[PDB]
Amino acid sequence: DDDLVDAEGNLVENGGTYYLLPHIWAHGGGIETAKTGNEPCPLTVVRSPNEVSKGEPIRISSQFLSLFIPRGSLVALGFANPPSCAASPWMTVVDSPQGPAVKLSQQKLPEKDILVFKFEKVSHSNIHVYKLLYCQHDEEDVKCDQYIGIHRDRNGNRRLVVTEENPLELVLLKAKS
């Protein structure tokens, strides 16, 4: 099984909320949302530039009713408290000229569209660190080797998108009740 482990050494609970913090303190803070481009509201998933900030608590769920999450299972990431305008708390990946980007949606999407992430163990580390993989849809299946990284746009928003270098390396801190 080899279940995902959180920042404090305890197994990650399937469906539990966690702050997705960068391994390296300097990289910034937690995950949030921001209104960018032509969006009518905060639909762009970004990383806070402030270290002291833990971002939004994020629910991490697989497609099973298991208590924990085996390392190779696909996961969906949703905000515990999504911005009012999103139809559901779940993140999804949307194509574009710039490339695939993590966004929220104004409509409820099918599971196959939100269960597109996968955490990957970062080797050479004492605390459990994980890269965040994006899993596209080949035929009817899926495949993940594209990593999610950060792209700072013209206004300083550190948008989460698929990048080819400097992928996110997170630790999952358990959010409080």
Cβ(103)–Cβ(45) below 8 Å: yes
Q: What is the CATH number of the domain that holds 83?
A: 2.80.10.50
Q: Please give the span between the terminal C-alpha atoms of the chain, in angstroms, as a whole number.
A: 27
Say how far apart CA 5 and CA 94 lie, in whole Å: 29
Q: Which domain range does residue 23 map to?
A: 1-177
- Residue 84 is given by DSSP the state T
Distance of CA 69 to CAs 82, 90, 97, 107, Å? 23, 18, 34, 27
Cβ(109)–Cβ(88) below 8 Å: yes
Distance of CA 115 to CAs 32, 34, 38, 106, 157, Å? 19, 22, 26, 17, 25
* Closest CA relative to residue 160, chosen from 123, 137, 119, 132: 132
Cβ(104)–Cβ(90) below 8 Å: yes
Say how far apart CA 54 and CA 61 lie, in whole Å: 20
9 CB neighbour count, 10 Å cutoff = 8
The experimental method is X-ray
Say how far apart CA 34 and CA 47 lie, in whole Å: 9
Beta bridge partners of 130: 121, 170
Number of domains in the chain: 1
